Amino acid sequence: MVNSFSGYLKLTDNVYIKNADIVEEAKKVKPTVVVNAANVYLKHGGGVAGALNKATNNAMQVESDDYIATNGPLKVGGSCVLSGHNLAKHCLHVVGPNVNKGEDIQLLKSAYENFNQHEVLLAPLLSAGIFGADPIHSLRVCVDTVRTNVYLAVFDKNLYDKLVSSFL
């Protein structure tokens, strides 16, 4: 399919980036898949997760609570596909490593590998916020791992400007 993604800078054959709120991009484009930067408990408190969940009027959290009750926590580096509610067809919840809490940064590659199961994704930079991975590192792992088409929404203007001026 052709989506209405607009205003993205090309990074590579398959990776595109924009200074935008992922919630607003999802609302406008209604992509097949929006990626959440989750924790293993799917407790969507802040950052991307909290903003996505609020935009679903808490439906994402209610669904997530049922998922955990049935299946238990995700693995670090793991994922699950749930509804995208009013934002997207699906939300791919992906758990990057919580580097600030001692988890292995190498698991960020495993996390991004989940994206390869989907032809097109709207996504954030995993682990680059409250989980404490260096943002440029997360971008480089994304570029070096994801082979499907990924549209990265970077909320923070200062960060975007730095990332797009950095080697990959």
Q: Which of 158, 102, 155 shows the shortest CA–CA distance to 131?
A: 102
Whole-Å CA distances, 63 to 4, 38, 45, 69: 27, 14, 15, 10
21: contact with ligand AR6 by CB under 6 A: yes
Please classify residue 50 by burial: count the beta carbons closer than 10 Å to its beta carbon, then call 0-12 exposed, 13-18 middle and 19+ buried. middle
* Of positions 37, 55, 121, 139, contacts ligand AR6 by CB under 6 A: 37
Rounded CA separation 54/103 (Å) = 27
Check binding of 23 to ligand AR6 (CB under 6 A). yes
Compute how many residues bind ligand AR6; rule: CB under 6 A.
Answer: 29
- The correct pick among 61, 122, 124, 143 for binding ligand AR6 (CB under 6 A) is 124
C-alpha span between 133 and 97 (Å, rounded)? 8
State the minimum distance, in angstroms, from the CB of residue 90 to ligand AR6: 18
Is 31 an interacting residue with respect to ligand AR6 (CB under 6 A)?
A: no
Question: Which residues, other chains included, contact 131 with Cβ-Cβ below 8 Å and sequence gap of 6+?
Answer: 37, 96, 97, 98, 99, 100
> Shortest approach of ligand AR6 to residue 46 CB, angstroms?
4
Smallest distance from ligand AR6 to CB 36, Å = 8
Neighbours of 94 (CB within 10 A): 25
Looking at residues 85 to 104 of the shown chain, list those that interact with ligand AR6 (rule: CB under 6 A): 96
> Contact with ligand AR6 (CB under 6 A): which of 15, 26, 33, 51?
51
Query: Residue 28 is which amino acid?
Result: K
Q: Angle at the Cα of 10 (from 50 to 143), degrees rounded to 5?
A: 65
22: contact with ligand AR6 by CB under 6 A:
yes
Q: By CB under 6 A, name the one of 131, 142, 143, 146 that touches ligand AR6.
A: 131
Does 153 interact with ligand AR6 (rule: CB under 6 A)?
yes
Catalog residues that contact ligand AR6 under the rule CB under 6 A: 21-23, 37-39, 43-51, 96, 124-131, 135, 153-156
